């Protein structure tokens, strides 16, 4: 199936997919000189205090920290958004090296990983008929940076020993992403994609300004995780990361 080696990576995903080649993919290079700052804009609504995670997976591409949708928790609103979007998951993408890992750029510039908190629009009852909506999903996105350590990026990076390849899951529960977030929640805004096939266009991206610093040690542990299954040849997870796609004259706005 599907995946960031040479055979079956990024630029395989056409053929099974053909909406790769569509007219609003991501990522994208964010380009700060043409972007504009859009005043018709309402601030950013970031509602995280009752977040409820229930489990960390390994599927293979990546890991997701699951949350409890079932009921209004955590929430994004504001900002470019009409209506409430629920937290599902979130995941990152990062490198092999510190140089590159991240998926949108800001004038060419590869962050070291970025993090993406996924939400469905509550419109649409659940995530399954949410993607199949233009305006279906809402993406947090936000740069990692090598520096000092995330104190609130401990527990996820401590628990991926449990979870080292394709299938293994483990309890996380009372993970809090507020712990996640940089100070500002200034941001870049555009329409486009799921990153990973399906690769489905119904995702609104909110990419913030501010990156998130971590230190080497904790992604270190992320370059440890597996692509393979357990008893299965050694293929370390680094490099998951989707490169930057056409901007086919959509317009990214800013907040600032
Ligand atoms: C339904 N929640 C989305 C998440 O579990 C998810 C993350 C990455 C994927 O490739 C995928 O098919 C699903
Ligand atoms: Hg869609
Ligand atoms: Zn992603």
Known sequence: ??????????????????????????????????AKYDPSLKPLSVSYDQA??????????????????????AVLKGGPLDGTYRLIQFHFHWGSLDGQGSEHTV?????????????WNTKYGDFGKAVQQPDGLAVLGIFLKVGSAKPGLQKVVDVLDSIKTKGKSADFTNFDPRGLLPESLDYWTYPGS??????????TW???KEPI????????????????????????????????????????????
């Open 206 to 208: 909110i990419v913030l």
């Open 1 to 34: 199936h599907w995946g960031y080696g040479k055979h079956n990576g990024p630029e395989h995903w056409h053929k099974d997919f053909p909406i790769a080649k569509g007219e609003r993919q991501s990522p994208v290079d964010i380009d700060t000189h043409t």
């Open 107 to 119: 004038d060419k510039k590869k962050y070291a990983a970025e993090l993406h908190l996924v939400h």
């Open 194 to 203: 799921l990153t990973t096939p399906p690769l489905l266009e119904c995702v």
């Open 52 to 73: 409820t995670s229930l489990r960390i997976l390994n599927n293979g591409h990546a890991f997701n920290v699951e949350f409890d949708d079932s009921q209004d928790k």
């Open 213 to 256: 610093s971590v230190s080497s040690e904790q992604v270190l542990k992320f370059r440890k995780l597996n692509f393979n299954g357990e008893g299965e040849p050694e293929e370390l997870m680094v490099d998951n990361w989707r490169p930057a796609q056409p901007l086919k004259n959509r317009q990214i706005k800013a907040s600032f």
